[PDB]
Amino acid sequence: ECQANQECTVAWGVCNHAFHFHCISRWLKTRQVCPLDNREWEFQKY
C-alpha cells in the first residue's frame, strides 16, 4: 500500500506473527482475529 502510494514498520502480536503495521491496521478494521492462527488479536511490540 505504501509502495503504490506513500513510515512502514512491523507490528507483532501476542502470537509473535509480525505482519506489516499498515496491513494489520487494514485487516483489523474488518476482522478481529489474527490472519494466520485465527485467534483474538492483541498488539505487542512495534
Place this chain on the structure above:
Amino acid sequence: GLISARVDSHSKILYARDVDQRSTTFEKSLLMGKEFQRRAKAMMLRAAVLRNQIHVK
C-alpha cells in the same frame, strides 16, 4: 406480482420486464396530483354547501 415477467406465446419465451423507475415515478406523481386536484375541488364544493347549511329534509 410474484414474478415480474412477460410471456411471449409466439416463440414461447418468458422475458423479464424491467420497471422504469423514472417513468413510473413520473406517472405516479402525476396521478397523485390529479387525485389531489379532484379531492380539493370536491372539498371546496362541500365547504360551500355546508356554509350555506344545505341539506335534504
Place this chain on the structure above:
Amino acid sequence: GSVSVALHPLVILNISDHWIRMRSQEGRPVQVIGALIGKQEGRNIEVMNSFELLSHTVEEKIIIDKEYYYTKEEQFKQVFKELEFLGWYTTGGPPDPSDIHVHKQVCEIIESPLFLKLNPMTKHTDLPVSVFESVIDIINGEATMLFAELTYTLATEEAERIGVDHVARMTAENSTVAEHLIAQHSAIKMLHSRVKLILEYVKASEAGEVPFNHEILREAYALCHCLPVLSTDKFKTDFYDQCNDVGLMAYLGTITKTCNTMNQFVNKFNVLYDRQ
C-alpha cells in the same frame, strides 16, 4: 511607489459593521474613526485587524481620545502579539481638512500612519475604498502636508479565501429568486464586458485603429468557432431530463404548499362553522 500595503477582508468588514452600528444607533449615517493594526515586515504594511476608536467633536474639529487608544492598545497587545499600530480609518468622501486634522494628531503615535477611506456612495472614476499616506511637502514657509493615494494588492490566504467563498455561495425581506438572479447577473455582466472588449479590439484592428496581431485574430476566430457549446442531440435530451425532474419537484412542492393552505382553511372553517 513608496510603501506597499496589503489588505485583509476583515478590516473592511469591521469598518462597515462599525458604520452601520453607529448609523442605526443615531438614526442617520455618521462619521466614524477607527484604528488599523497589523504587521510591519519592512517594505510591506499588512493591515490585519481593526478596532473602534473613541473621538470627540469640538466645534467642528475632531480629537482622538488618546487615553482610550492606550487602554485598548494595552488590552489587545495580549491577544495579537505580532500586531502593532498601523494607522486609522474613516468613512466619508474625499480627504477633507477634518481628515488631515485628525491625521495631525494620529501622526504623533507612529512615524507614518495609514489612512483607509471607505465610500459607499461612489459613482465616479476613483475606487470606493482607498488608502492614503501623509507626505511632508518641501514647500517653503507654512508647508501643508499632502495626502498621496497608494494602491493596494489582493493578497489572501487559501483558508480565508475558501471561507469568504463559502459565505458568498450561501444566500439569505428580499426575494430569494431576486437574489439568485442578481448573483447570475453579476457574472453575466463580467462575461459580457470581456466579450465586448474582445469585440471592440477585433473591430478596431479590422480597419485602421490598432496594429492587428495575427495570433490574437486567430484566437478570436477560434473563440467564435467555440459556439454553440454542446449543441448535440444527446445534450438536448439530458437537458430536458433535468427540466422535467425539476418540474416534478416543483409540482410536488406546490402540492405540499396547497396542502398546508387547505389545512389552514379547513381548520378555520371548523372553528367558525363548528357544528356537532
Place this chain on the structure above:
Amino acid sequence: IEAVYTDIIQGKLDQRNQLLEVDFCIGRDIRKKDINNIVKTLHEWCDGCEAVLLGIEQQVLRANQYKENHNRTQQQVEAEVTNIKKTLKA
C-alpha cells in the same frame, strides 16, 4: 490520432457511432476578408448577453413586485383583523 498528438485538436474517436468528438481545435489562419464574420459572431454573443441581462432584470423586478404585493396584502389583512378585534371589544 497523429493529428491529436500534434495538439492542434483535442478529441475522442467513437467507433460505435463512427464519430470524432472535438473538444478544442486551434484557430486556423484568418484572412482580411472574413474578419466581419468574427465581428458578427461576437456581436451576436453580446446581443445574447444583453438580452439575458434584460430578462434577468425584468424577472427580478417581477419577483420583487410579487413579494411586495404579498407583504402588502398580509399587512392589510393584519390591520383589518386587529381593527375588527378592537371594535369587537365593546
Place this chain on the structure above:
Amino acid sequence: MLIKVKTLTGKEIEIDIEPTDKVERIKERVEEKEGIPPQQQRLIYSGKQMNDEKTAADYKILGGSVLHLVLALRGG
C-alpha cells in the same frame, strides 16, 4: 454603601451592606439567601481580580461602581 453587582449578560443585583461590616456575615447571608457557590464566581473591580487585601479603604466605592460577576469558563 450600596453595591450594584452586574453580570456580563446584563443581569443586575443590588446589595446594601455596611461600609465597615465583617465579610463573613455578608458571605453567609448571600450563600443562604441566593445560594451562589464561591467556586465559580469571580468578582472584578476596575479590571482587577479582587484578592484578600484591605477592602473599602483604598477603593473609592460610590454607589455601586460596577462590580463585575464572572462565572467560570472552561472547555475542551
Place this chain on the structure above:
Amino acid sequence: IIRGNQLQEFAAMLMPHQKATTADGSSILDRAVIEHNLLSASKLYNNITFEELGALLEIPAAKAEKIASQMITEGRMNGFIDQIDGIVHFETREALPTWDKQIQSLCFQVNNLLEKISQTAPEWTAQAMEAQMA
C-alpha cells in the same frame, strides 16, 4: 502509441533475462509495449472494436480482448467489454458535465484573449475600458 519499428534498437540493448519470452512467443518488451499502447488508446478512444483494437496493436483479434480484460479486474485501466458487439468502452461523458467543462474552457479562452489584448496594446485596452465604463 509506440509502434514496433522504433523498438528494434531498444530490444538489442536489453539484458538477456529481460529478453525472455512468456511461453507464447512474445518477449517482455513486446508485451509491456502492448499494454502501454492499449492504455494510451484508452485515452484516444471512447470505444473500440476488437478487430480495430488488434489492428493497431498487431495482436490479431483475441489476445487483444484477453489483454484488455486483464488490464481491468486490476484497476490498471477503466472501461467495460461488450463481447456480443465485440466493443471495449473506455470512458463515457455524461453530456452535462461535458457542457460544464466546455463552458469553463470558453471562459478561460475569453480571459486568455483579453490578457493577450491587454499585453499587446495596453494603451488601447486602457482607453477601451475607460470608454466602456463611461
Place this chain on the structure above:
Amino acid sequence: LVQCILDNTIHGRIDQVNQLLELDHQKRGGARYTALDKWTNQLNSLNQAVVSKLA
C-alpha cells in the same frame, strides 16, 4: 452461474434464448426517484388526512 446469482455472488442475469450472461453494470443514482416516490406517498396520505377532516 445460476447458483452464483441465487447466492447474490454474481450481479447478472442469463439469456437462455441467446446463451448469454448480461451483467448488472447499471443502477446509477436512482435514490432520487425513490425519495420522490416516498414524497408522493406521504403527500397522498396527507391529502386523505386533511381533506376528510370535517369538510
Place this chain on the structure above:
Amino acid sequence: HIKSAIPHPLIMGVIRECGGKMHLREGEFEKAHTDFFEAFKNYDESGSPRRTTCLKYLVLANMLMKSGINPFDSQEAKPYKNDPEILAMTNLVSAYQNNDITEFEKILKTN
C-alpha cells in the same frame, strides 16, 4: 469448559485435532482452521509422527474458508512447507490462492 490447566503439548494436540475434525465434519471451517492450527502448533512443539497430518488438515481447512493468507507464512508451518508429505498441500494452496484451474487439476491428478 476447562480454563485453568497447564497440560502437555500433546494432550492439547489430541483434543484440538479432534475439535478440528468434528468442525470439518459439521462444516464450520473457520473454527476447524484455528483448531487445526493449535493442534499442529502443539504437535510441532512436542512430537513428530502426528505432525504432518494436522498440517494437511489445517491447509484443507484454510482452503475451505475462502482461503486468503498462506498457511505456510507463520513460523511454525514454514519449515515443513517443502516436506515430502506436505509438498502436495503447499502446491495445492499455491494453485488455490492466485486461482488457476489448470495447476489445481494437475496437482490433483498427479497426486
Place this chain on the structure above:
Amino acid sequence: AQSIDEIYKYDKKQQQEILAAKPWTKDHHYFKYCKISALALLKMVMHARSGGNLAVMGLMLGKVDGETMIIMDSFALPVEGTETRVNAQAAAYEYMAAYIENAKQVGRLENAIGWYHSHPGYGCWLSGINVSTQMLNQQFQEPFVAVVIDPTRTISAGKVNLGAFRTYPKGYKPPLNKIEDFGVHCKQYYALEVSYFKSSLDRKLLELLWNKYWVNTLSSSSLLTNADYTTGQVFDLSEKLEQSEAQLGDKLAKATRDSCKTTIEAIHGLMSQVIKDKLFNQINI
C-alpha cells in the same frame, strides 16, 4: 433597504422586557434559532485557525428576540490552552470585564450572549466539561449559548463547520446515530439551528469584490453537485410529512417550509441551467 437594515437596530426596552419576563424558565425547549452575523463568523474562524491545534475560545455579544439568539460580535480571550483543553484562569476574566466597558465607550450596546470555543480536530459538540460550564452559565446567566468551531475540519473540508448548543437543566428526564457524532452527554443538551446573516453594506462590498469567480458561477451547474444533498432533504421531508400527518390525526407548517426551501433551490439550479443554455447554446445557430 429599511427592512433589510433591521436586526442591527438595538433597543433596550424589548431586551429588558424579555429579560424580566424570563419565559425560558417554563419552556426549556425555547431557543431553536441562532442568527450569527458575518463579522462574528469570520472572527470566530480566524481566531480558531490562529490557535492551530491548540484550543482557543472567546465571548460573544448579541441579544434575544423571541425564540432566537442573535450574535453580532465575537471576542478574543487571552487564553493559553493546551491541545485539548482551555482553562481561562485569571487573565481572560479581567480581559472580558475590561473589553465590555471599552466597547461601551465606543458605542457597542450589545451585552454578553454566550461563549464560543474551538475544537481542533474533534468535530462540534459539547463534552462533559463543556456541558457543565454551559449549564452553569445558563443557570446563572439565563440567556446563553455555547458555540463550538472546528478549525482543522473547516480548513480540510472547505466549509464552515461550527455549531450552537444549549444545555438542559439538571434533572430534565425527558437513537444510535447521536452517540458517535456527539458525546456520552448528548442527551444533556440540544443543537440550535444555525443560520448566518449579513448587512447591506457588507454584501455591497462583497459583491463589489466579486470579480474573479464569475467563471465558477457560469459553470457551477448545481442539481449535480447537490443531487445527493437534495435527495437527502427529500427523504427527510417525507418523514417530516409523515410526522405532520400523524399530528393531524405546527409541524405541517415546518414541513411545508422545508419542502419550499428544497424546491426553491432546485428551481434555482434549473434557472441557472436555463440561463447558461441561453447564453452559450443559442448563439451561432
Place this chain on the structure above:
Amino acid sequence: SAVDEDRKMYLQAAIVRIMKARKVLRHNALIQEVISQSRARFNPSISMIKKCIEVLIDKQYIERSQASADEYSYV
C-alpha cells in the same frame, strides 16, 4: 528518567486527543491510532499505552463501556 516521563505524557495527551476525536473506540483501534500518531517521535510500547489508558480511566478522562469492556468512551 526524563525520557520515560516525556513519553508517558505524550502518550496520555495522544490518548486524550484521540478519545475526544472519536468519542468512542475499541482497544485495538485506540492502540493503533496512538501508535500511528506518536510514531513521529518514538516507537510506543504497548505496556506503556495500556498503563496510560488505565491511569486515564482512574482519572475519569475515559470510561469502559457497560456492554463491552474492550470499548472506551470519552467523558
